[PDB]
Amino acid sequence: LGRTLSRWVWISLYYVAFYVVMSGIFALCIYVLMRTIDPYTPDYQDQLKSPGVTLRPDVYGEKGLDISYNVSDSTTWAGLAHTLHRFLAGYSPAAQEGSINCTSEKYFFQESFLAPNHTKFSCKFTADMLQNCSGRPDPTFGFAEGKPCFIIKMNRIVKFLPGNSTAPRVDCAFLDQPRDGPPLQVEYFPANGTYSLHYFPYYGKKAQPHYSNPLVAAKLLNVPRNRDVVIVCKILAEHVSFDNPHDPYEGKVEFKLKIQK
Amino acid sequence: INDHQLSVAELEQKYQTSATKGLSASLAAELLLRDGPNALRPPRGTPEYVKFARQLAGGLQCLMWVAAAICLIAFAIQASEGDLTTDDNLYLALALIAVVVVTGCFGYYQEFKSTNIIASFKNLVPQQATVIRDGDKFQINADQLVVGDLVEMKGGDRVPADIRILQAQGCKVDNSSLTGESEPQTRSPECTHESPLETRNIAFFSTMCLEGTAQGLVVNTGDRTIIGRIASLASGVENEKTPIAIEIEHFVDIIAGLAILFGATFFIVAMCIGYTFLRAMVFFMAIVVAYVPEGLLATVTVCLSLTAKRLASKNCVVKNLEAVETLGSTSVICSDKTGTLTQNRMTVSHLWFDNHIHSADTTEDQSGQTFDQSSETWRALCRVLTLCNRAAFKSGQDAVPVPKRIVIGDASETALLKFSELTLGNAMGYRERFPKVCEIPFNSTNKFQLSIHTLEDPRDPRHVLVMKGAPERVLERCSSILIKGQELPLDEQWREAFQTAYLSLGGLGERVLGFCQLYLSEKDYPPGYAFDVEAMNFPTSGLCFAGLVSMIDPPRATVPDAVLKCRTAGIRVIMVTGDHPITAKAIAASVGIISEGSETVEDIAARLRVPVDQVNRKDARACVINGMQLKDMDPSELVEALRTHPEMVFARTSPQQKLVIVESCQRLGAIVAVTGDGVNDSPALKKADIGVAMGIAGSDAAKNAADMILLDDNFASIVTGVEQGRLIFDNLKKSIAYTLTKNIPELTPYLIYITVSVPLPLGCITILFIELCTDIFPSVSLAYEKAESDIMHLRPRNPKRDRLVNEPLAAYSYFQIGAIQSFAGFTDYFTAMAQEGWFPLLCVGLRPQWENHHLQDLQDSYGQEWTFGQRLYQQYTCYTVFFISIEMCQIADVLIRKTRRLSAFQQGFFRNRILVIAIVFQVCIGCFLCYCPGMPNIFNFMPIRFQWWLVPMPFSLLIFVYDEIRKLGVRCCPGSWWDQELYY
Numbered sequence A: 001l002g003r004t005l006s007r008w009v010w011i012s013l014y015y016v017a018f019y020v021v022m023s024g025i026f027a028l029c030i031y032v033l034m035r036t037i038d039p040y041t042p043d044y045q046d047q048l049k050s051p052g053v054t055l056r057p058d059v060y061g062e063k064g065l066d067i068s069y070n071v072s073d074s075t076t077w078a079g080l081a082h083t084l085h086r087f088l089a090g091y092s093p094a095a096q097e098g099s100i101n102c103t104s105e106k107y108f109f110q111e112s113f114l115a116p117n118h119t120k121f122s123c124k125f126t127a128d129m130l131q132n133c134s135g136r137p138d139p140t141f142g143f144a145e146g147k148p149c150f151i152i153k154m155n156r157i158v159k160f161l162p163g164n165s166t167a168p169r170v171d172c173a174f175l176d177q178p179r180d181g182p183p184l185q186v187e188y189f190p191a192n193g194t195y196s197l198h199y200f201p202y203y204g205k206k207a208q209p210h211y212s213n214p215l216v217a218a219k220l221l222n223v224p225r226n227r228d229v230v231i232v233c234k235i236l237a238e239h240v241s242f243d244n245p246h247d248p249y250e251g252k253v254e255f256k257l258k259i260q261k
Numbered sequence B: 001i002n003d004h005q006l007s008v009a010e011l012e013q014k015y016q017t018s019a020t021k022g023l024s025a026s027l028a029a030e031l032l033l034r035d036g037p038n039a040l041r042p043p044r045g046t047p048e049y050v051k052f053a054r055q056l057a058g059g060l061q062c063l064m065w066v067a068a069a070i071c072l073i074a075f076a077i078q079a080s081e082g083d084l085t086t087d088d089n090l091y092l093a094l095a096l097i098a099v100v101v102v103t104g105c106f107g108y109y110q111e112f113k114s115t116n117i118i119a120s121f122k123n124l125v126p127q128q129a130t131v132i133r134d135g136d137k138f139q140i141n142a143d144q145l146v147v148g149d150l151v152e153m154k155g156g157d158r159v160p161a162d163i164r165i166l167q168a169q170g171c172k173v174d175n176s177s178l179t180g181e182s183e184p185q186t187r188s189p190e191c192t193h194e195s196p197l198e199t200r201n202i203a204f205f206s207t208m209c210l211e212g213t214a215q216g217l218v219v220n221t222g223d224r225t226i227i228g229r230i231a232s233l234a235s236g237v238e239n240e241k242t243p244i245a246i247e248i249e250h251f252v253d254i255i256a257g258l259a260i261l262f263g264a265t266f267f268i269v270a271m272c273i274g275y276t277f278l279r280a281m282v283f284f285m286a287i288v289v290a291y292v293p294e295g296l297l298a299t300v301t302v303c304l305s306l307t308a309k310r311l312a313s314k315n316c317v318v319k320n321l322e323a324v325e326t327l328g329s330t331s332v333i334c335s336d337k338t339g340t341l342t343q344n345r346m347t348v349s350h351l352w353f354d355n356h357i358h359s360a361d362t363t364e365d366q367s368g369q370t371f372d373q374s375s376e377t378w379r380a381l382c383r384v385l386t387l388c389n390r391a392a393f394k395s396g397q398d399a400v401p402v403p404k405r406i407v408i409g410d411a412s413e414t415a416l417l418k419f420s421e422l423t424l425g426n427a428m429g430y431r432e433r434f435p436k437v438c439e440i441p442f443n444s445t446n447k448f449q450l451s452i453h454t455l456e457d458p459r460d461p462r463h464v465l466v467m468k469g470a471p472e473r474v475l476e477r478c479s480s481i482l483i484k485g486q487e488l489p490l491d492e493q494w495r496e497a498f499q500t501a502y503l504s505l506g507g508l509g510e511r512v513l514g515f516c517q518l519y520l521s522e523k524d525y526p527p528g529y530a531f532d533v534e535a536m537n538f539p540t541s542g543l544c545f546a547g548l549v550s551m552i553d554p555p556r557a558t559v560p561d562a563v564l565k566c567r568t569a570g571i572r573v574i575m576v577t578g579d580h581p582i583t584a585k586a587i588a589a590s591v592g593i594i595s596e597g598s599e600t601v602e603d604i605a606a607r608l609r610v611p612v613d614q615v616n617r618k619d620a621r622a623c624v625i626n627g628m629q630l631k632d633m634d635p636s637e638l639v640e641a642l643r644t645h646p647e648m649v650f651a652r653t654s655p656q657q658k659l660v661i662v663e664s665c666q667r668l669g670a671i672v673a674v675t676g677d678g679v680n681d682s683p684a685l686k687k688a689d690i691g692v693a694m695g696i697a698g699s700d701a702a703k704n705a706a707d708m709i710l711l712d713d714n715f716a717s718i719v720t721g722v723e724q725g726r727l728i729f730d731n732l733k734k735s736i737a738y739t740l741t742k743n744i745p746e747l748t749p750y751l752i753y754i755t756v757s758v759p760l761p762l763g764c765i766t767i768l769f770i771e772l773c774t775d776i777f778p779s780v781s782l783a784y785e786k787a788e789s790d791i792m793h794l795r796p797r798n799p800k801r802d803r804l805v806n807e808p809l810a811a812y813s814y815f816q817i818g819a820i821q822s823f824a825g826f827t828d829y830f831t832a833m834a835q836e837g838w839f840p841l842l843c844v845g846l847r848p849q850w851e852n853h854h855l856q857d858l859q860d861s862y863g864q865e866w867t868f869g870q871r872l873y874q875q876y877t878c879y880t881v882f883f884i885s886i887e888m889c890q891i892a893d894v895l896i897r898k899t900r901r902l903s904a905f906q907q908g909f910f911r912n913r914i915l916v917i918a919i920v921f922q923v924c925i926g927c928f929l930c931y932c933p934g935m936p937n938i939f940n941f942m943p944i945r946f947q948w949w950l951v952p953m954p955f956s957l958l959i960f961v962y963d964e965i966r967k968l969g970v971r972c973c974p975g976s977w978w979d980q981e982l983y984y
């Protein structure tokens, strides 16, 4: 074309060499980056200043969480029941063999790796601690009687301490109309709906490969039928904050519920 | 042509008018109704909104308009699928539109201000005229003139119509505007020439009766006038595109081609990966838009405005921004003579006395070399021309410079009086003291002026007789002559020397005027006795000759050096004039258009005494072409003659012939600049690539047709203009490279995001902040860089081979510096991701989970679970860190763009203070955008850690070192492969 074959091949070789040198420099920089970071603890936890809160079962409707079902038709809650069984399958004794019994009732600190394969101990959580809402003897998880059970899970953060004063608690209540009507009554599993203090801190996937999040199941007992309600469940702890407009899931979870009759 | 040739009798029956009675009043009224007003029709079809629309149109403007349209269509497609986060399409579209609109407003403001500055010189005149009707002479308006009206003319009139003179007595008019003749020309009924211009029995519209009275008939009115036909021819001329616009169009073509290539290849990639066809089309449009810079147009306009301001500091007013570069690329300068290269005023040029030709100073500021003035012969001659002159100065001027000072009288009288006031100090008061007992003015019989004066000394009242006239008539009246301050008899040798001097001084086009004096003793004439003019008691012969004084319209003071500098800059200078070839050749020799030792074919024939048939044309370097010879020629011969003769002067050229010369020069493939001051230059001025009009001496048509105007009438401003043009070319290409290099860093993250599906590294708002805010100032400050080489020695750039942006520049900027900046930004992005918990391998393919609003517990490399909002804040951190990487690399990029060939150590790191201020400003704006409260909410910027500021610094140093080594290798081996391929 505009250049002879020799000129084109010379410039092509020059560009290939230039790009190879740049690629090598980039690879060396990424290798040096990977060599400096710690494999156990994050260096600069910055956006993890407060754990998020998630709910099971999670159906997100149009924008946010929106659970609705027909009490007369079992097919409506069949999917939610399947979701609950699938989630609680992970918290089964067969899946908790690696972990060990844990009744320290305080911060289960670990400065050394005294577990098999140079890991740390993880305190076990089994579904039976949820008792009524564990799936036995009620596979419907309370959905059949219009008394749904919702599992509240707090996101794990490495070496995050909720507070020594009291084990972190969960509090569910109406948001749109708290004063109107009777207040929302909720039964918690385990007792008082507290996350036991020996599940903290989290030491990371490498240190605790069998770590299991503690669970609290909240059962709603007085929910008006055929009426749309909004329920907010917050985490009461000293170091957990839920005042963040730009992240609605930080320290709390809000969801619409509509139990059609 | 039949207007002048026809005699009185047939004109009477042709125009139904009487040579004495005049046109009938009813006939005059009906003819006025039929033909229309005498005033030339002024075009006024230039609305303001049309000019604004033109300022909104152009290569980069059309590219940006199409980019905005593409953004809107892509947003429509995305809305068809109901997609999210489409507001960036509008952000980009309105950004492009706002940039285009603000730039157009700035350019319109510049043009409007320049037009207002130029318009101060306009001045309407009612232009009353004297006409005979019904036998009663009276006055009417200029437009009221109708064809055939019998009209009178007197000194100081503007000649409100084209008029064939039927009676004239010593009428002299100036045609320096319509024609190129500086010398006043006589109007007499006698006619012999075919050309209406040269014909002596016809007057012209835009002229002035310098002296005399006359009366004649009206032959043409309105737009049928010579000035009217010239204006119509100028209107027929169509302007072409400026060289900088052509360069911009070529650059836009390069941008569009590269954008289409990249978009098509990555659209095929999107097919191969598995994206939906509509998604791949949207990606295509995104890449095409990403290759379109929006802040480039603003920087180009600002650089143009800065250069225009520098020029306006030197009284160079450009009517448009694009004209400030044209002179830099000019290869041919076609120059008008009378009024452009010359002062258009007759002045004393040479003095032959004592068998010696002395040269006087002709600069308007009197800054030239003077002649010897310590001779009593000079004192005698000074008294002779002082007492002979009868011109008088205008009152109220004592601080006004003498050459510019107003004088009343003949042009020769004005020049003589000015020369006296320059040599003497108070010749105006000197003339009053000597009584004029006998004064004889110029007569058709005598052909001289005579004056008898009484001496100032009371002891010596001896009468002094002083005479001024034509040399061929003066010499026969003389017997003795002043030589070496003594009275010497006339021999054959003195007459031979007189003839040789007269012929030589006439061969330069200068009118030669002879002066003589005699002493009348009181024995012959008593003091109380009064001399009588009609008695002719004077000897009137046997006079004592003093010397010869030759006068010519001189070049302006700064013209010769400016012409020489332009010639050393490789620009060939052609002189085109409507004047006689003798005067044109003398002026060309004076101003350096014809170099010393360069002789024409006539000169060679005179030297060898050989007819021109055997004379070899190639031996002659200079060439003078008459208008008739040009008309006999044909375009092939004209092109061959242009190529053959390096130095060429055109004399006796009509406006159409000047237009044809400009057309031929342009068609040969050269950028032509035309300098002019008169209406006869307006067609060529409009046809030229750049037209430069004289400000003080220019006419309305010349100023309107011209792109540039010299307010101080300094011809030396042209060399400043060409220097600034070449400098703005170099600095503009530097700035374009600087602006272009950052396109690839902004686009590569989008390619990586689409293909590999990492979380988005860069957002659109950050890209807008980079393009529109941070990097406008450094690229503009790049326009203050000094020249690396000497601008004047270089040849004019080849318009075809030398482009503003070529493939080497684009390749280097896009795919070496841009590649390094992309690598720096990605290194810093991966550092930020890993230090927060996301290892590089986890980032690959993480986009679908990262952007899923239903996933509020996504796990990082450490197993920590993130909500959507926290991941979005990490994304904003990535935006900020990649933006900082680009800015840090651009700091070194502007430093490397400082010079194309010279080392940064060879030039100064800090000599461009504006560049240092720009870098400081960029750093400050980046720091403010990062660490300002509430920033993450409005603009997706996050307060980052100092460690991420340092990660891109090694890449900045790498850019600097690589560019320095490249420039050193280019300097070391000027003709090698490295220079050929790696130099831009």
Ligand SMILES: CCCCCCCC/C=C\CCCCCCCC(=O)OC[C@H](COP(=O)(O)OCC[N+](C)(C)C)OC(=O)CCCCCCC/C=C/CCCCCCCC
Pocket: A019, A023, A026, A027, A028, A030, A031, A034, B744, B748, B752, B756, B814, B815, B818, B819, B822, B823, B826, B840, B841, B844
């Ligand atoms: C025209 C020619 C264009 C050429 C473009 C490509 C240039 C070269 C770039 C990539 C090609 C090679 C791919 C890998 C690059 C990095 C190499 C590297 O060393 O990686 C290391 C990591 C793995 O970690 P490890 O095994 O060391 O850890 C060991 C410790 N343990 C096991 C405990 C974790 O692998 C990784 O992360 C891989 C991460 C890859 C991320 C996707 C690519 C992002 C790159 C963007 C640069 C774009 C530049 C565009 C130039 C301008 C074009 C106009």
Ligand SMILES: Cc1nc(Nc2ccc(F)cc2)nc(N2CCc3ccccc3[C@H]2C)c1C
Pocket: B070, B071, B074, B075, B088, B089, B092, B282, B283, B284, B285, B286, B287, B289, B290, B291, B746, B747, B750, B760, B762, B763, B764, B767
């Ligand atoms: C996140 C995102 N989104 C879009 N959307 C889009 C835009 C136009 C279009 F025709 C179709 C889709 N464009 C993006 N870039 C790609 C990167 C880039 C670099 C410089 C200038 C503009 C852009 C826009 C063009 C980005 C980074």
Ligand SMILES: *[C@@H]1O[C@H](CO)[C@@H](O)[C@H](O)[C@H]1NC(C)=O
Pocket: A069, A070, A071, A072, A073, A226, A260, A261
């Ligand atoms: C929910 O489904 C049952 C199943 O038949 C139906 O009877 C009931 O009306 C539904 N609820 C509402 C509010 O329509």
Ligand SMILES: *[C@@H]1O[C@H](CO)[C@@H](O)[C@H](O)[C@H]1NC(C)=O
Pocket: A101
């Ligand atoms: C762990 O749990 C029970 C109850 O604390 C304890 O007594 C026993 O040792 C363990 N049982 C199993 C099945 O691991």
Ligand SMILES: *[C@@H]1O[C@H](CO)[C@@H](O)[C@H](O)[C@H]1NC(C)=O
Pocket: A131, A132, A187, A219
């Ligand atoms: C939970 O189950 C126990 C039986 O183990 C029963 O006594 C109790 O009432 C149940 N509580 C709820 C809230 O269902």
Ligand SMILES: [Mg+2]
Pocket: B176, B177, B180, B336, B337, B338, B339, B340, B676, B677, B678, B681
């Ligand atoms: Mg002129």
Ligand code: NA
Pocket: B239, B240, B685, B686, B688, B689, B690, B691, B705, B706, B707
């Ligand atoms: Na023009």
